[PDB]
Amino acid sequence: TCCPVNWVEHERSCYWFSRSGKAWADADNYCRLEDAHLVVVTSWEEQKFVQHHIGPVNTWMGLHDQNGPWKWVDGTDYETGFKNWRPEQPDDWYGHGLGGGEDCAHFTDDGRWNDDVCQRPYRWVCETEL
Ligand SMILES: O=c1[nH]cnc2c1ncn2[C@@H]1O[C@H](COP(=O)(O)O)[C@@H](O)[C@H]1O
Ligand SMILES: [Ca+2]
Ligand SMILES: [Ca+2]
Ligand SMILES: [Ca+2]
DSSP, X not given: OOXXXXXXXXXXXXXXXXSSOBOHHHHHHHXXXXXXXXXXXXXXXXXXXXXXXXXXXXXXXXXXXXXSSOEETTOOOSTTSOOOBOTTOOOOOOTTOSSSOOXXXXXXXXXXXXXXXXXXXXXXXXXXXX
């Protein structure tokens, strides 16, 4: 009863799943304007719940290394926290030829994470805490 309309409640958090794509910085701005942040996944249980609602689609999360080390957007510690990288990721790939490596994390079609080019338009998930 405390999540906004069209948001999904799960373990004291509210989630909004986009049905359109945006570059990471744009999806980040979108979530912030809803008094929310790009989804911060801290457990296997929260990972399975997000997977259920996104399906087999590349989807941005609130994890990036644009300024150096890996950081979650709300300040949640990366080093000591949950990780679900696909084997061989993050790899900071430059071979896409678009400039730079790969600095934004997204869920891949099977749920496991990948670092990709932040400019790519992907769907995204916003999260707010109750
Ligand atoms: O041609 C390639 N060479 C090396 N790695 C690649 C190549 N294409 C894609 N990748 C890797 O695969 C990731 C994309 O994962 P996907 O979007 O699930 O296919 C990229 O971010 C790179 O890590
Ligand atoms: Ca969370
Ligand atoms: Ca990087
Ligand atoms: Ca990658």
